[PDB]
A = this chain, B = another copy of it.
Amino acid sequence: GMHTQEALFVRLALDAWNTQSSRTDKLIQSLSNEALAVETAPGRNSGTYLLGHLTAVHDAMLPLLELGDTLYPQLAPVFIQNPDKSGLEKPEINDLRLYWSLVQERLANQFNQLQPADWFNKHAAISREDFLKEPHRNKLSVLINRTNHMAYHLGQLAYLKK
């Protein structure tokens, strides 16, 4: 019944995250460093930047979902707070590939241990008071939102496959 239904909608949301994650991971693995460094389209973000961006955004989900601290806080100034052509030094690409992999794996670990119910609790960026009015502003809503963020950028990364 109701406990089972809650488990089914967590499955749906997690299956979409996992599908986008698989596609993103496989795409990144398929590209050489030289191919990743190219702009996704003229004047637009490089694959390297999008990799770092996705990594930083996913890492930030850890504290937002009360699943632990970020692993790599120094990525956020480079890949969230500043644009690609900022002139700020980036990590080497193979280090970014590893950070991506370790953030994704930590999230998978943590997600796989959460009970369906925990997903319906508030995320860290909303007050208890505001969550009462809008209980849809929960941890699952973050998962859903970031899954679409990833899909959006995956459409751009797709243009690096020549």
Q: How far is the CA of A92 from the CA of B9 in the complex (A)?
A: 41
Q: Is A141 at the interface (CB under 8 A from chain B)?
A: yes
A144 touches B2 (CB 8 A): no
Q: How far is the CA of A11 from the CA of B140 in the complex (A)?
A: 12
Number of interface residues of A (CB under 8 A): 36
Q: Is A15 at the interface (CB under 8 A from chain B)?
A: yes
A12 touches B156 (CB 8 A): no
Q: Among B19, B44, B154, which residue has its beta carbon within 8 angstroms of that of A159?
A: B44
Main secondary structure, interface of A, reads helix
B16 touches A144 (CB 8 A): yes
Restricting to A118-162, which residues have a CB under 8 Å from any CB of B?
A: 120, 135-136, 138, 140-141, 144-145, 147-149, 151-156, 158-159
The residues of B that contact A19 with a CB separation of less than 8 Å are: 148
Q: Is A6 at the interface (CB under 8 A from chain B)?
A: yes
Q: Among B5, B136, B147, which residue has its beta carbon within 8 angstroms of that of A148?
A: B147
A5 touches B120 (CB 8 A): yes
B5 touches A144 (CB 8 A): no
Q: Among B6, B12, B13, B155, which residue has its beta carbon within 8 angstroms of that of A155?
A: B155
